[PDB]
Subunit: 239 residues, 2 copies
Amino acid sequence: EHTWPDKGSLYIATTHTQARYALPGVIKGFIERYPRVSLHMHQGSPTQIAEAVSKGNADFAIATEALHLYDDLVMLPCYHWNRSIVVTPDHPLAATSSVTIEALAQYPLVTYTFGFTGRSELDTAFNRAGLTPRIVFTATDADVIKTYVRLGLGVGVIASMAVDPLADPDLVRIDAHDIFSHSTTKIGFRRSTFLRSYMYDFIQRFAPHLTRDVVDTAVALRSNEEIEAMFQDIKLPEK
Amino acid sequence: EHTWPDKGSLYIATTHTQARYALPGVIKGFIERYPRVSLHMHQGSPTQIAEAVSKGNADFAIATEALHLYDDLVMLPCYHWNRSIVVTPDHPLAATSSVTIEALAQYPLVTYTFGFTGRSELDTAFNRAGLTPRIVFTATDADVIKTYVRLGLGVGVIASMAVDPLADPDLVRIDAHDIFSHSTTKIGFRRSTFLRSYMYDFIQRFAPHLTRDVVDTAVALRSNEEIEAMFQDIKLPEK
């Protein structure tokens, strides 16, 4: 009754973070809406996702910049996100009134894999603070990070969207927005890709401010930098 | 009282599957046992894990062959594992008395990422059966695979060790051991790595049949093939 007969395919390339926490609700709304649209989703590295859209068979890249690198893709900012610190309750950090980055760097760290899903913002942060991060555990998944934090491997740094006190009781969470710069999740595709109505639809559903009018305009800019500044006077979604 | 004062480091490179399901209990037993041993664990692709041990800073590669590719690593078989089919209960497969591969290939598939964690055994299987797999979703993580299966993207093929009816109620599981050949998880390191007592200890704890005597012998074989046939007359662990 309220579905579309639109026929086609939607091939998306994304990371674990998006597919796990950002995507499922959207995809559910989409697949129900567009039954004759075959949906594909393939997890890979920022470099692999790039390839898949730049050279391969993917329609859309959904990743935190970079990327969707470069460059030679139309990039549209979707939302901002940052990190939380996860530890065990008898950890020293859990008992420190306000946690600085210096107090954090005294400890072994459990976090995302190199380059990354917001790791380079972490390393940049440590460099800027004249500090050396003791990285003990790297993984793509926030689920494994929690496990190893739970058994005492170290301090966990993950996306805040990957934290749930009802799904993760007993791990203490520490908001670290004033420790790390935020990350921007973006969406993109080749300039030659014909934008179907279900494509705009998916886009707007993932990023509301990305209406068909601003999407076509952004395409016409021929610059992902000018697309970014397009939204500098509004507040992007935060997750 | 029952711990060791042994000082050193254990740098391991593995996949999501091992770190999530095979590793945590072992690591927990290890870290408690060897407090002055700094433990590292880094998730990556079979090729990245190889590099890390062949050229990088990793001590041990823990991965399903390949690898731990090649070759130029000492490879020791740890255990055998196979796949299960996960679907929703009103799925046609869930209602088919005994599921063949042909009946499986009629459906969109949700599984591991290319090359892989037992995916090439899947593709080989389909090739052998003169069938074309409709791969819709690839991921490193069995957790995301379940989610997308749950919302109806397709049929899930995962490691059986990643299935738990108490942790995953309402997804029906289909044992597919007679559909796919099993996979062998292996462990390895450079010939030049000095084997510490905590290293043998970790090894034997991950693979009981890998005692210090069979480990040193395997090292002396100068062939990972001859190491494999060493255990052809015993039954390796199955998970």
